[PDB]
Symmetry: D4
Subunit: 118 residues, 8 copies
């Protein structure tokens, strides 16, 4: 099927298991992939016939910026829940990246990806 892909949505947040993570918070990066039939929207060229990526980005960002979760799993589940509330969506993958996570090791990124589908 077709898909809408949002990549690199960068939002300051305070999610974290440990107290020290919630004093000042850190950078979070969100990807969203939405599986949805896009044929109708190419016929109508009407935004109402697709899933608006402007609303998706603002909603995703507000969740990330909101009151902190312990787990990024829970942040990703809240974003995925939002996407599936649109009955046209077949499936969604939400990647919550925590690239500044406190890990004593040298690494590029750590993330969870929450998948949902009908």
């Amino acid at each position: 099927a077709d898909r809408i892909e949002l990549r690199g949505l960068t939002v300051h947040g305070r999610h974290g298991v440990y107290d020290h993570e919630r004093v000042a918070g850190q950078r979070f990066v969100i990807d969203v992939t939405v599986w949805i039939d896009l044929a109708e929207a190419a016929n109508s060229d009407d935004l109402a016939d697709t899933y608006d990526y402007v609303r998706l980005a603002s909603r995703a960002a507000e969740i990330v910026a909101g009151p902190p979760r312990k787990l990024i799993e829970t942040v990703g589940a809240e974003i995925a829940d939002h996407v599936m509330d649109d009955q046209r969506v077949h499936a969604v993958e939400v990647a919550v990246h925590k690239p500044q996570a406190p890990i004593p090791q040298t690494f590029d990124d750590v993330a969870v990806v929450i998948r949902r589908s009908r």
Copy 2:
């Protein structure tokens, strides 16, 4: 099966739902992936036996540069339509990236991917 992959085709355009997007326009980036049997072309080493990526790039670019669509969904559908008119193609994915989209949030990219297959 085999595939031809065009990546990062960068073309100025004016697509957009909102009037202000069509005054000066913005950068669009296209990826095309074509699924097609390539064994015959390796036997003949004859360009006529494969899907010419030179024609693909020019056709994709002309569509993107053409009169604006409201939706990038519609741009991607027009490119995908072109590819499937070649009876040898099994499937195609066209990614239309709108990395400068007007979104109040900080993000790397937003795109739609239009998939077609036999």
Copy 3:
């Protein structure tokens, strides 16, 4: 000489010459370089003896997100003028990047750099 370097401060703003740019705004990316003697701060290990990079980032961001200017020159000069209130500062160089500027050509970046010094 000693310097403090802030790179890639990313802030949504509405600066621009043309009406179409004030509707939704666009991404701005700020670099600041501050020339300042840092020996005292290294001797004391006291934040008071250096220029706090948090103050540097937060104030520059407030300017960028604030009242729209027509020119990025004007934004850079405001940031630079405020930095030189700190009498310990020898010179400052503010780069205001407008990577999304509406230009019909394909390019990576456009920016102005404002310098001020004692």
Copy 4:
């Protein structure tokens, strides 16, 4: 299902078939992908209900830093073995990258990916 993705874990090691590789060693880069149901952890927001990426990174790094293997296949199998010892994990992919491998040719990366599943 859901997944946890660790990327770019960078650890000095001495793995290698050839003696000269084990005198000083070289840079290794590890990716780990873990397939696991994350719904319960979003309900509880309890780290105990997910696979802790802090422990994963330290365990992966200790293996890579440990006494050398001849093959990076064997390093990847040891990491994958560790992940599957958690009964909640459905599958895992461990990529062991050896980007400095002694190869007379110019190349970006060489890696093995060890996959396991129930």
Copy 5:
């Protein structure tokens, strides 16, 4: 199953449909992905029990550097043919990238991927 991934193998060549491409030639970039069971090699830690990526890189590079093909399809088929001559290999994908291809448009990369499997 498991896989060996070679990425970014960079080799000067002269492949091309058009005469002017074969006077001086251009940069080619090869990726190879090999699907093969790696469990035995982790048990033995014996290079003889896996597919040696040193030989793969040299063989791939020699093909690319060899007498020119008209099509990169044909270069990729020759590399893939080589890999499948090892009876242990389940499948292979060879990506031949021609990032400097003569295309009047602005683009990041163009490539063909030749897939083979048992």
Copy 6:
């Protein structure tokens, strides 16, 4: 001092010493740096008081896409000479990159930088 920095202007052209380079042409990448007093423009916020970066990009691109030169030195000098018609300009530095230049060695970039000043 104050400057305007255009980076990565990307334009197809046919410059080159050898016949084979004039058949299809290749990618050129232009940087321009203009040294100019920007205080007045920041005071007035009037585009007329600075060097318009649109004029900078469009004119440089027209030169690059125009009559082929044998040397990139000649292209850079043309761009630089035209920029110094603006008497407010202290100096200009034009880098003409030829990233795709036919060289048998593997390299990232080759470029010439032309400077002019009062």
Copy 7:
């Protein structure tokens, strides 16, 4: 003049002004530039006649990983002071990057550069 350039030395540390930063620490990235006459070393091809970049990296890393400082200025000055014990060194410039610094704004990097010279 002649110089030795170490870039991107990556070391976990616990420097920072705030208590929350000393709990788990964060990534620090060091650059060192050493101005030194290298003609003798090129004449002799003797490591003793130059500044050994292994000594440069290992000692800088030991400082970064060592007792936590409040300011990165203090870290940079320690590295620089120790480098100038070598009387052959004309000048040294140490950049201490704190890419993960807790700042509420979105930014790429923050760093201080300490310079010392005869």
Copy 8:
């Protein structure tokens, strides 16, 4: 002033202090910068009136791939010394990067820069 800039010339070599480095060798990356008056070449558009960047790349590569030196200082000085045979050259700066150098710390790059001038 005017200059010619070659960046990222990539050549396998066997330079190094330690025996283990001469067995298989490693990647070296060369930059050359040549300060030279380019007005005449832009006037004539004659390759003879400038420094040919093909000669620059091919000769530097031959040195890098040639007899192994213990120090990268020695390699850089050889490249620089040969460049200054051209009496039109004001100065040259050769950077020899050893990105794969055996250092136990994690780092991006290590290099020496050799300068020569009239």
